[PDB]
Amino acid sequence: KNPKSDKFKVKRFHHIEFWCGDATNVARRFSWGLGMRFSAKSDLSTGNMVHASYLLTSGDLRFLFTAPYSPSLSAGEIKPTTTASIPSFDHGSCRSFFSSHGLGVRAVAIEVEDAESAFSISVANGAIPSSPPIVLNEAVTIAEVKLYGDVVLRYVSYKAFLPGFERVEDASSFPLDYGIRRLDHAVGNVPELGPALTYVAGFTGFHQFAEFESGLNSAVLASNDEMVLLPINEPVHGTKRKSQIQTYLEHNEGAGLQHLALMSEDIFRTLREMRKRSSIGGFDFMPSPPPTYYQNLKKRVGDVLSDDQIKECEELGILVDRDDQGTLLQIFTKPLGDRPTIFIEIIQRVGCMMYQSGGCGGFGKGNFSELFISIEEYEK
Amino acid sequence: KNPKSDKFKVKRFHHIEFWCGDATNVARRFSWGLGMRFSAKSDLSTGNMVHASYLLTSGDLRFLFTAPYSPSLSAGEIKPTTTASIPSFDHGSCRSFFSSHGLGVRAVAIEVEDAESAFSISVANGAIPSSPPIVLNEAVTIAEVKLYGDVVLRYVSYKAFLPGFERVEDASSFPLDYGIRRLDHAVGNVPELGPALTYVAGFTGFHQFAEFESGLNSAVLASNDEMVLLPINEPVHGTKRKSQIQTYLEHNEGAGLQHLALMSEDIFRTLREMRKRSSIGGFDFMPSPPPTYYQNLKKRVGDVLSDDQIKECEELGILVDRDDQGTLLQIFTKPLGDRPTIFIEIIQRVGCMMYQSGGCGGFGKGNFSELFISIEEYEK
Ligand SMILES: Cc1c([C@H](O)C2[C@H](O)CCC[C@H]2O)ccc2c1c(=O)n(Cc1ccco1)c(=O)n2C
Ligand SMILES: Cc1c([C@H](O)C2[C@H](O)CCC[C@H]2O)ccc2c1c(=O)n(Cc1ccco1)c(=O)n2C
Ligand SMILES: [Co+2]
Ligand SMILES: [Co+2]
């Protein structure tokens, strides 16, 4: 059931912005690790004395890495004379963010029809304003409201990347590509799911995306065409294995973004290319499941991909779940940084053709039960 | 003239420690970029709740990358119960360091016979104590005194990497190597060279290493066998091209480490391997000199390396200078991070054989005049 109750017109995910202490080093590690191209910059070379910002791109996926310069570089400026290309940026907010959380996502940015309307309707419906709408170079409008923890939902709208960014020179832009094409979903961990759901659903009009005892309870908010998907988790206390959600909240100093799920047009090529570079600057993957997993996946997805492909899934350590309209392939990286907080998910969806509809396959919650069962089978 | 006046027995450079906000991402960028192996760790996986520390190695070169966890992880601990493997570490000092300077070197660590004596004699001779000597696991003694800015000279001594670090598992350690073998010199920028020289020379007994109007004035302190080399720069104000030293001090918020010079056993292989990876996660190099440089280098170093090698120097953009005992090959990277502060120098020294004596060739100051002259020649 999709009551299509969006309070403003939303399009798709536009970019994800990381706040860090050195944008250069994070951007180059991510670029090599995920096979994303260096496509735009805003920094000293472009006259920005406030923040260094570098954009990586793969397909429609846009990763933005920003860090503050010394405030002394811009001490004579005021907000009307700023040289920041992103007007919401704040030295104190960014330093406080990185030192409280470590490396992580500051903004989940969705493109909308009208960022001023989106901000107005949002706050009129309970959103906590973060940065009021500002029109950049008569071309682009940008506005921010609080999402959870210190993460903001960022609205961007185009009358026709951002003003004041520069296209990178082709000799500095190497066309890496491991198959990743767009952001599928972005997931937050909070201490209490109920109030978090109520707040966000309340100011966007996003509806609960339907689904179908380890870790969490979760629920997925979705826009009208279910292309913008925002799952949210809370811990399940009092178990025997400590919830990784509660571990997240302890090491992250509170609520925040847990994982980004990136869609690949060919998860086999992606995971081969990423695994090649794991121990030479790229990303580590979570430990593979026992072969009993792949010894049971013929009995569940054997109509969807051949035994040659299921064997190919066994080498790369890929998980496979299934809804009632589609099948989901997925795997999880180790944490992107020092703390056991944010990680990335690689996914590919098969089914639900009309274009592919959003969320085809679900999000893999079944893989929890399948994993534990596959563990016990292997053990004995 | 070498009066060999060291006030305590010094051996060689032991490691360089970077303070950052995320150790993981800097370490992986440096590892791929410079061809250094991941060899030791101290972090949550090893029971350290205070700081994450990862060591990269290439030959005798040891790069340490450290960042703080949330203080909340270790709030119950006191200095006697600490789980930090490096006792000098301090959350507040490290956060304040990264937010004031951005990415940079916190410690230049030299190995000594007796770190307690080294610290005692040092402070008795004007050194500002930074961290008193502490004996780690009855095996290693560690002590710190201020060097310049927020950089400390770190003494380490072994009765027989550090206690509480772990050897990395071979499946996580990929044996990268681009030829780099040891740290040659570490260079500081200060606002006033005179007082800086007087202070450091005063508490170490290091002597002025002999040399032989753009940029700087500099002077090199050296230990008895001139293997530990600490050059220091100050700006030359009132020119026409702004001193890069003064630019350093403005963007770094004061004095600090300017460049690390890394010796390669084969600078041609090193620079080929590093240049291959420049735009896929590695390091950028400063713009090459005009071919007029290489058109004049036959007339100055033509007795040292063939015209085939001088042509090989032209492709890689390598500089060549010459003292009266040796010849120096060198090239400079772009800044390692967001700010125009720290950069790395790759060098190889030929001559002064007895083993090779320290500083063989000098440090390339002549390449300043040669560069400007080679510019003007090309232009007309
Ligand atoms: C993050 C995740 C997901 C979903 O993506 C996520 C949805 O997006 C949104 C709501 C549900 C929520 O779970 C699904 C399966 C997972 C994991 C996951 O992190 N791990 C690793 C792990 C090891 C020990 C503890 O967790 C897994 O094993 N499985 C199977
Ligand atoms: C750092 C450096 C050195 C020495 O290593 C250093 C010694 O270690 C210790 C004392 C002297 C001191 O200069 C030598 C030659 C250099 C550079 C250097 O940074 N650049 C780049 C640049 C472009 C514009 C402004 O600077 C150069 O061109 N040349 C030729
Ligand atoms: Co997911
Ligand atoms: Co040098």
From Swiss-Prot, chains A, B:
It is found in: Cytoplasm. GO terms for molecular function: 4-hydroxyphenylpyruvate dioxygenase activity; identical protein binding; iron ion binding. Pathway: Amino-acid degradation; L-phenylalanine degradation; acetoacetate and fumarate from L-phenylalanine: step 3/6; Cofactor biosynthesis; prenylquinone biosynthesis. Keywords: Cytoplasm, Dioxygenase, Iron, Metal-binding, Oxidoreductase, Phenylalanine catabolism, Repeat, Tyrosine catabolism. The keyword Phosphoprotein does not apply. Fe cation binds at H185, H259, E345. This is 4-hydroxyphenylpyruvate dioxygenase. It comes from Arabidopsis thaliana.
